[PDB]
Amino acid sequence: SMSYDIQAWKKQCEELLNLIFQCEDSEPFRQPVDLLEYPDYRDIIDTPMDFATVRETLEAGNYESPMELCKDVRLIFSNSKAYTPSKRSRIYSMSLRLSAFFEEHISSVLSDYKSALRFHKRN
Ligand SMILES: N#Cc1nc(Cc2ccccc2)oc1N
């Protein structure tokens, strides 16, 4: 059961998403971009992603691992870097700060999960 629990990441990710939604820096990234308020968005971005979509995908049980969730979160930030490439932009700075916060906190979730996997595979 509790040591090396291969399902513990789910609640840990739910908690991290709660922290992210609290952050003022997540405001531009909470919901899908409105494709009529920004009609050139899809000209630039192939695969839109936002934190409400990540949170619903997790709730629906559609991530097989925390690495899958992490891929979608990283897409939020890589899409922002493509759409708002200027380091002058306060939106660029927001994305950088929130990315760094996410990467700090996801680190232990991933390493713990992979350790659990290695242990169960070995035994
Ligand atoms: N001002 C401003 C601005 N407004 C957008 C739209 C946006 C923002 C965040 C994520 C996705 C899309 O980019 C900018 N640089």
Structure resolution in Å?
A: 1.5
Distance CA 6, CA 2 (A): 9
Mutate to test the pocket of ligand 1, among 25, 30, 91, 93 (most ligand atoms within 8 A of CB): 91
Cβ(89) to ligand 1 under 6 A? yes
Preceding residues of all breaks in the chain (C to N beyond 2.5 angstroms)?
none
- The answer, yes or no, to whether any atom of ligand 1 lies below 6 A from the CB of 80, is yes
- DSSP 3-state helix, strand, coil percentages of the chain (rounded to 5)? 70, 0, 30
* Domain at 1-123, CATH class: mainly alpha
**Protein residue closest via CA to atom 1 of ligand 1:** 91
For residues 29 and 76, the answer to whether their CB atoms sit within 8 Å is yes
Write the residue with the smallest CA distance to atom 3 of ligand 1: 91
Distance CA 75, CA 29 (A): 11
- Nearest C-alpha neighbor of 32 from the set 4, 59, 53: 53
Cβ(1)–Cβ(105) below 8 Å: no
Task: Report the distance separating Cα 82 and Cα 42, nearest Å.
Answer: 12
Experimental method: X-ray
Residue nearest to ligand 1 atom 12, measured at CA: 33
Closest CA to 76 of 52, 51, 57, 58: 51
